[PDB]
Amino acid sequence: TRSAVVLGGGMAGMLVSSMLARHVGSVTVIDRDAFPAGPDLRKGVPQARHAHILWSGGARIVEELLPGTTDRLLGAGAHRIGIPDGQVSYTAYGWQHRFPEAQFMIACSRALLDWTVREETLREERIALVEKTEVLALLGDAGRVTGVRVRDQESGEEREVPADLVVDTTGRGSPSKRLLAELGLPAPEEEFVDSGMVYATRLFRAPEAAATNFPLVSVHADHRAGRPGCNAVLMPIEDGRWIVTVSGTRGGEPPADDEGFARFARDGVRHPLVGELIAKAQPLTSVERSRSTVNRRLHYDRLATWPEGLVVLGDAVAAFNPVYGHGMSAAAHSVLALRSQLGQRAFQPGLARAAQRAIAVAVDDAWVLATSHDIGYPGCRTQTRDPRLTRHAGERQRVTDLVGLTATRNQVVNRAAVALNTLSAGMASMQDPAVMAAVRRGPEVPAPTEPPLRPDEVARLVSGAGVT
Which residues of the shown chain bind ligand FAD in the complex (CB under 6 A)? 8-13, 31-33, 44-45, 47, 50-54, 135, 169-171, 173, 175, 199, 290, 292, 314-315, 322, 325-329, 331
How far does CA 275 lie from the centroid of its chain? 24
Residue 322 partner contact from Cl ion, ligand FAD, none using kind-dependent CB cut-offs of 5 to 8 Å: ligand FAD
Cβ count near 143 (within 10 Å): 14
Q: How far is the CB of 52 from Cl ion (least distance, A)?
A: 11
Q: How far is the CB of 57 from ligand FAD (least distance, A)?
A: 10
Measured distance CA(163)–CA(309) in Å, rounded: 8
Secondary structure (3-state) at 464: coil
**Taking Cα atoms as reference points, which of 7, 387, 26, 395 lies closest to residue 166?**
7
Helix spans in 347-410 (H): 351-362, 364-374, 387-390, 393-407
Measured distance CA(445)–CA(448) in Å, rounded: 9
Question: Which residue of the chain is nearest Cl ion when measured via CB?
Answer: 290
Which 296-335 positions form the footprint of Cl ion (CB under 5 A)? none
Examine residue 46 and tell whether it contacts Cl ion (CB under 5 A). yes
How far does CA 30 lie from the centroid of its chain? 22
Residue 152 partner contact from Cl ion, ligand FAD, none using kind-dependent CB cut-offs of 5 to 8 Å: none
Measured distance CA(147)–CA(5) in Å, rounded: 7
Distances (CA, A) of 467 to 333, 459, 462: 52, 15, 11
Measured distance CA(114)–CA(185) in Å, rounded: 33
Contact 32, 135 (CB under 8 A): yes
Residue placing its CB nearer to ligand FAD in the complex, 169 or 410: 169
Residue placing its CB nearer to ligand FAD in the complex, 11 or 403: 11
Residue 135 partner contact from ligand FAD, Cl ion, none using kind-dependent CB cut-offs of 5 to 8 Å: ligand FAD
What residue type is 413 in one-letter code? V
Residue placing its CB nearer to Cl ion in the complex, 26 or 290: 290
Q: How far is the CB of 9 from ligand FAD (least distance, A)?
A: 4
Residue placing its CB nearer to Cl ion in the complex, 43 or 385: 43
Measured distance CA(186)–CA(190) in Å, rounded: 12
Q: How far is the CB of 428 from Cl ion (least distance, A)?
A: 33
Q: How far is the CB of 434 from ligand FAD (least distance, A)?
A: 29
Q: How far is the CB of 248 from ligand FAD (least distance, A)?
A: 13
Contact 138, 174 (CB under 8 A): no
DSSP string for 429-453? GGG-HHHHHHHHH--SSPPPSS---
Strands 87-91 and 216-219: parallel
Q: How far is the CB of 103 from Cl ion (least distance, A)?
A: 26
Residue placing its CB nearer to ligand FAD in the complex, 53 or 102: 53
Q: How far is the CB of 384 from Cl ion (least distance, A)?
A: 24
How far does CA 189 lie from the centroid of its chain? 23
Q: How far is the CB of 395 from ligand FAD (least distance, A)?
A: 29
Among the listed ranges 137-145, 157-165, 283-291, 407-415, the one in contact with Cl ion (CB under 5 A) is 283-291
Q: Rg of the Cα trace of the chain?
A: 23
Residue placing its CB nearer to ligand FAD in the complex, 199 or 439: 199
Examine residue 172 and tell whether it contacts Cl ion (CB under 5 A). no
Measured distance CA(373)–CA(404) in Å, rounded: 12
Residue 45 partner contact from ligand FAD, Cl ion, none using kind-dependent CB cut-offs of 5 to 8 Å: ligand FAD
Q: How far is the CB of 70 from Cl ion (least distance, A)?
A: 26
Among the listed ranges 172-180, 284-292, 304-312, 438-446, the one in contact with Cl ion (CB under 5 A) is 284-292
Measured distance CA(125)–CA(128) in Å, rounded: 7
Residue placing its CB nearer to Cl ion in the complex, 3 or 47: 47
Residue 199 partner contact from Cl ion, ligand FAD, none using kind-dependent CB cut-offs of 5 to 8 Å: ligand FAD
Among the listed ranges 127-135, 174-182, 287-295, 401-409, the one in contact with Cl ion (CB under 5 A) is 287-295
Examine residue 41 and tell whether it contacts Cl ion (CB under 5 A). no
Examine residue 26 and tell whether it contacts Cl ion (CB under 5 A). no
**Taking Cα atoms as reference points, which of 140, 55, 89 lies closest to residue 408?**
89
Among the listed ranges 41-49, 66-74, 265-273, 448-456, the one in contact with Cl ion (CB under 5 A) is 41-49
Q: How far is the CB of 343 from ligand FAD (least distance, A)?
A: 23
Examine residue 292 and tell whether it contacts Cl ion (CB under 5 A). yes
Backbone angles phi, psi at 387, to 5 degrees: -60, -30
Instruction: Work out the burial of residue 327: count CB atoms within 10 Å of its CB; fewer than 13 is exposed, 13-18 middle, 19 or more buried.
Output: buried
Number of residues that bind Cl ion (CB under 5 A): 4
**Which residues are at the interface with Cl ion (CB under 5 A)?**
46-47, 290, 292
